[PDB]
Amino acid sequence: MVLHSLHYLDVAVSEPSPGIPQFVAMGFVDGIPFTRYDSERGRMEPLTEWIKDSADPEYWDSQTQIGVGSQHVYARSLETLRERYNQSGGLHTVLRVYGCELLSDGSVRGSERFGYDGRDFISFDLESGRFMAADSAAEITRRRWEHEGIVAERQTNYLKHECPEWLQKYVGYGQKELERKEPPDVHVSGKEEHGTLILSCHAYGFYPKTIAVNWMKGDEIWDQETEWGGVVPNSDGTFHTWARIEALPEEREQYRCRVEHPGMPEPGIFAWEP
Amino acid sequence: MTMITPPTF
Amino acid sequence: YFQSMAGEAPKVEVYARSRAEEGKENILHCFITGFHPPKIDVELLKNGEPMPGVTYGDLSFNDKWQFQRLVYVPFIPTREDIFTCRVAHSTMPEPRSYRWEPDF
């Protein structure tokens, strides 16, 4: 199983706009943002008290230079793909995800993926130690990188050594925020509409993301009649979700919502109490 | 060094 | 052509941080996912007027390279008000309004 993950998402665009910097790098530990570089701010910065408190200034200074240097490589990378795919100017996007996962048996999963203009470009897998190119145009990068030996060695080293070394430290520094359990506050709303009762089970403010929200009628889960929202983020790092069913309003009292979450000592059952 | 620069295309 | 672009067209969830209590302060979120390219017009509205102090969380993306954005604003739900998120994107032929479903 995956105990912990460190991931970086890069977004690089050819022309900035309101709320879209030329370049943004975001770090996540266990799915939670903790750091950001943004080309408008020009500095790497903490998104959590725990990285602020544990990082020293060499961390922010080095990440800052790595963000700025990335800004410049993605700018050249965009010009290169622009020429290669025979495109005209305007909004173009390079994306990257990369990171490692610490597994139950003390093993390291890690990968690096690049997207261009919303499709796969090129990807690297630790196990294979080789690049998969999406098309002939990525096959040119792959051939260059493969021919020289250097890029494979540098990414492996990072994804197998430095990336999990940093992940172990971040789990050290963030233990209190990352191990914490906040139970959902659960509330069932209902409105009658065109002669149907819509019943919604809302789960507010829970952490972590892992949750069971189901509607039951009698002894059965009424899953075929249920619609679920996403598990979606609140502004404060917690999560929100819901589950909705339609009922005959004479049957309202036959419906209840079961919720299970690691922050709740017991599963709860919720009904509409008008 | 936690983040790394991407390789050039 | 617009039918043909459903795969890059934003999905919208509108939800409060907390169970609404009349005149008690809360946060309204509009979570937009599944859209490409990343330029998108999002407004949070009380009774069809732009709410002040809206924060545009940064872009992220998923396993298919589709963008997501969390947009949010302090608000004070009343039973008397309608809170919407209007979203316009290039994959949509017209702006769509998404109502916050009050849960009081």
Numbering used by the authors:
A (entry chain A): 2 to 275
B (entry chain F): 1 to 9
C (entry chain B): 1 to 104
Copy the relevant paper text.
Here we set out to determine the structural properties of Acar3, the most highly expressed MHC-I molecule from a long-distance migratory songbird, the great reed warbler Acrocephalus arundinaceus (Acar). MHC-I molecules are expressed on all nucleated cells and are central in adaptive immune responses towards intracellular pathogens, such as viruses and intracellular bacteria. MHC-I molecules present antigens to CD8+ T-cells, and if the antigen is pathogen-derived, the cell will be killed, whereas cells only displaying self-antigens are left untouched. Six distinct pockets (A-F), previously identified in human HLAs, are present in the Acar3 peptide-binding groove (PBG), which is created by the α1 and α2 subunits with their α-helices lining the sides, and the shared β-sheet that forms the bottom of the crevice.
From this assay, the three top-ranked peptides with respect to half-lives of Acar3 complexes, i.e. peptide 1 (AMSAQAAAF, “P1”; T½ = 11.3 h), peptide 2 (YMTLQAVTF, “P2”; T½ = 11.2 h) and peptide 3 (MTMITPPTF; “P3”; T½ = 10.3 h), were selected for further studies. High-quality crystal structures were obtained for P2 and P3 in space group P212121 at resolutions of 2.15 Å and 2.25 Å, respectively. Comparing the binding modes of peptides P2 and P3 within the Acar3 PBG, it is evident that the five residues at positions 5-9 are well aligned in both structures, whereas their conformations differ substantially among their first four amino acids. Conversely, the Met residue at position 3 (Met3) of P3 is positioned in pocket B which causes Thr at position 2 (Thr2) of the peptide to be accommodated in pocket A instead of the N-terminus. Consequently, the Thr2-side chain mimics the usual N-terminal interactions of antigenic peptides through engaging in a tight hydrogen-bond network with Tyr9 and Tyr171. The side chain of Gln64 was found to play a prominent role in facilitating the unusual arrangement of P3 in the Acar3 PBG. While in the P2 structure Gln64 forms a hydrogen bond with the peptide-nitrogen of Met2, Gln64 creates a hydrogen bond with the carbonyl oxygen of M1 in the P3 complex. Following the conformational differences in the N-terminal segment, both peptides align starting from their residues at position 5. Two recent studies reported on an N-terminally shifted binding mode of the HIV Gag epitope TW10 (TSTLQEQIGW) to HLA-B*57:01 and HLA-B*58:01 (64, 65), closely resembling the non-canonical binding of P3 to Acar3 presented in this work.
